[PDB]
Amino acid sequence: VVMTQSPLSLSVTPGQPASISCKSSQTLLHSDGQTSFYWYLQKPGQSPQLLIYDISSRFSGVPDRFSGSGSGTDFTLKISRVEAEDVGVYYCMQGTQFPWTFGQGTKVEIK
């Protein structure tokens, strides 16, 4: 309902797959009128980048390794293989009718 963002964990074993999830309240129509869900990656360093929107369209730099999905009010991000560099905080956010509210993000570590 409020984008808490699932707990800050995933398997940290290198080379293994992972799934990151979030929760909201409704079909999320965007101020431009389209349904939207946004996935951003906050690197451990200087800045965020946009990965996926509306669990379907993927942005340059992450079309082969990352994939969006979900149903109802429960949405996810799939990482095909968590390939060593895939660290940082992955956020699901309401880039919709809602006033750009972000959850806590999922902390990703690889060990």
């Binding site: 963002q5 951003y40 906050q42 965020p48 956020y91 956010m93 006033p99 750009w100 509210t101 972000f102 959850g103 806590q104 993000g105």
Partner: peptide, 21 residues
């Protein structure tokens, strides 16, 4: 613009030239 409070998630600081929370 987006604000990043020290250890919190991202906060929206308004679309152009808009005002919110």
């Amino acid at each position: 613009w987006v604000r990043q409070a020290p250890g919190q998630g991202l906060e929206w600081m308004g679309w152009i030239p808009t005002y919110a929370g």
